[PDB]
Amino acid sequence: MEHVAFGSEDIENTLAKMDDGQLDGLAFGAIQLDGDGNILQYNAAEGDITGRDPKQVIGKNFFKDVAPGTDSPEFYGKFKEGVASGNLNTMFEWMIPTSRGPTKVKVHMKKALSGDSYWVFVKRVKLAAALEHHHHHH
Template structure:
């Protein structure tokens, strides 16, 4: 099994060399979208994070149907500007909160190296607590 780090400098080529099973076994979420935001692949790590099964989300629009909390300039705006301009690579933090407990994540958006598709790679960030906060 190939090991891929979330912060790999050459993530496009790393993903291109992985089988579907290897993408499912990544330790972070991986969602492949077409230029309109339709979900083409949704790996098991992302399924476990969100509680949504791949078979229920593949073929649906990520921004409108699956994660409407991402319909913002910061997220979907960045995605569609990247698709339009061809300058797609971005890294940022976001909070997912649609039909799930608010979850802080780090997002890596990259264009596929071998197809006209786009990847959202998602790594859960653990919220820091201060003394007296509930765990």
């Protein structure tokens, strides 16, 4: 009846009942990974922004092709980290380097309700500028 909300208290409960059709309707990115990190689900929204295909990512790991070079303890490490505890709950910002240039965004990974899957949402942050903070060598 109501619309979906990013980082909602019942975001998983809602999506669990919703299918791929509605998922793509979302105004944000949604990616479901398995215990190993294999792309189980992929909403069109994210596929459009990033430029990746859902039926093409299916089976492939998020750090395998979906994100080459993301095999760090900050991203990949956290993913498997929570999996060991049985509740991958992490919320931080990530940099998505593209052809047009790097752009900061919001990343949220919450383990599914069934436990045999993990939800990964992504929302582009607001526009903003920045400067350099370099000093003389010491």
